[PDB]
Amino acid sequence: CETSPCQNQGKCKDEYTCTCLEGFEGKNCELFTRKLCSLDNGDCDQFCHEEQNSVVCSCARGYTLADNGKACIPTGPYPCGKQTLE
Amino acid sequence: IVGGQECKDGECPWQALLINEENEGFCGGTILSEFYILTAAHCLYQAKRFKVRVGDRNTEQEEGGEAVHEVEVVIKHNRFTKETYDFDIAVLRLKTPITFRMNVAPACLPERDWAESTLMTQKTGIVSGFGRTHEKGRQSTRLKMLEVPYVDRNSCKLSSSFIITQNMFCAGYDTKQEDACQGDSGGPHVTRFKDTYFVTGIVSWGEGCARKGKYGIYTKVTAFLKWIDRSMKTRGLP
Numbered sequence: 115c116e117t118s119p120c121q122n123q124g125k126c127k128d129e130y131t132c133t134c135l136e137g138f139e140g141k142n143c144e145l146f147t148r149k150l151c152s153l154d155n156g157d158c159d160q161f162c163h164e165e166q167n168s169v170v171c172s173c174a175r176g177y178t179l180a181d182n183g184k185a186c187i188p189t190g191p192y193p194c195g196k197q198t199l200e
Numbered sequence: 201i202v203g204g205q206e207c208k209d210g211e212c213p214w215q216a217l218l219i220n221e222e223n224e225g226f227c228g229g230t231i232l233s234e235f236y237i238l239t240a241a242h243c244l245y246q247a248k249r250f251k252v253r254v255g256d257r258n259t260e261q262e263e264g265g266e267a268v269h270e271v272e273v274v275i276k277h278n279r280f281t282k283e284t285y286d287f288d289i290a291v292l293r294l295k296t297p298i299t300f301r302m303n304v305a306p307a308c309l310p311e312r313d314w315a316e317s318t319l320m321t322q323k324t325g326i327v328s329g330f331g332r333t334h335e336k337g338r339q340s341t342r343l344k345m346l347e348v349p350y351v352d353r354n355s356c357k358l359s360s361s362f363i364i365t366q367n368m369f370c371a372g373y374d375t376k377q378e379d380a381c382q383g384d385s386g387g388p389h390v391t392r393f394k395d396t397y398f399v400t401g402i403v404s405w406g407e408g409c410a411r412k413g414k415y416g417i418y419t420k421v422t423a424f425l426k427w428i429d430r431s432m433k434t435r436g437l438p
């Protein structure tokens with residue numbers, strides 16, 4: 115940890131370990147978790163849009179937006195756009 | 201569909217088939233909900249009377265779970281232009297609701313801006329139907345699907361003997377022998393995103409089927425998402 119291998123003020127242990135501040139990930143906290151729609155769809159399951167420079171996710175017909183604000187929860191066995199399993 | 205593969209059990213559950221007074225399929229449609237089917241406006245002029253079949257994978261064999269629905273209301277886009285097929289879009293409201301089951305489920309309608317940035321930028325979408333399996337051949341009695349690459353708008357316009365309006369897009373192959381074909385008109389073009397299928401086109405027209413230097417032309421669903429929403433928010437007779 116002598117060189118401060120952990121970026122963005124993450125905390126270095128010890129062959130070493132990074133415990134990142136919120137908002138950062140990667141092994142060395144070098145990757146932003148906040149992102150816009152252009153990258154990994156904003157981490158949204160379905161629809162992504164930007165409000166106030168911030169990502170907001172939403173869901174299509176037959177889904178509800180999960181409390182985590184990203185996942186889409188089906189409202190029944192036949193939600194839209196899924197091939198039928200049974 | 202020329203080339204591609206037969207849809208497997210559950211694989212293309214949003215497919216609908218418009219059947220004429222003789223009970224012959226003549227156009228496809230896409231299931232949007234329990235009551236609404238999306239199709240091409242030009243199809244409406246190609247049978248005097250028609251009904252909508254869902255859940256069919258093999259047309260020469262009743263097989264339970266197939267169902268035929270009457271049409272209560274036809275909603276053609278008023279700006280459908282017969283000479284150019286501009287605005288080639290219609291919605292059908294059914295007399296009685298579809299009950300979703302194996303092989304019968306709706307495709308998702310996407311939000312417009314998202315669809316433009318995240319579906320229309322993908323490499324490919326999937327087209328399906330019961331149309332001819334060869335330009336000079338006959339309608340499939342089996343539902344087929346085909347992966348078709350999106351073709352950029354400039355290339356599309358340059359390929360075409362006919363105007364490509366902003367309400368249309370090209371998908372398919374320059375010379376590979378794979379395409380949609382007569383009888384597929386009105387059916388689904390969908391684009392996958394993270395395991396979910398969203399409506400991105402309606403099979404519209406083509407110069408022959410899978411001809412070298414020609415692409416399939418699809419109604420561009422993004423241009424009509426608002427129109428589809430209005431047509432659907434309607435919800436039954438007053």
Ligand SMILES: Cc1cc2cc(/N=C(/NC(=O)c3cccnc3)N[C@H]3CCCCN(CC(=O)N4CCCC4)C3=O)ccc2o1
Nearest residue numbers: 283284285362380381382385403404405406408409416417
């Ligand atoms: C994605 C996709 C590919 C594809 C190919 C299709 N195929 C045909 N035609 C034949 O293949 C054929 C072949 C030989 C003789 N007659 C007909 N469509 C023909 C059917 C006959 C009418 C001509 N016309 C309309 C037409 O041109 N307009 C020019 C601008 C406005 C409309 C077709 O659209 C049909 C649907 C398809 O959707």
Ligand SMILES: [Ca+2]
Nearest residue numbers: 258259261262
């Ligand atoms: Ca059948």
Ligand code: NA
Nearest residue numbers: 373374411414
């Ligand atoms: Na071609």
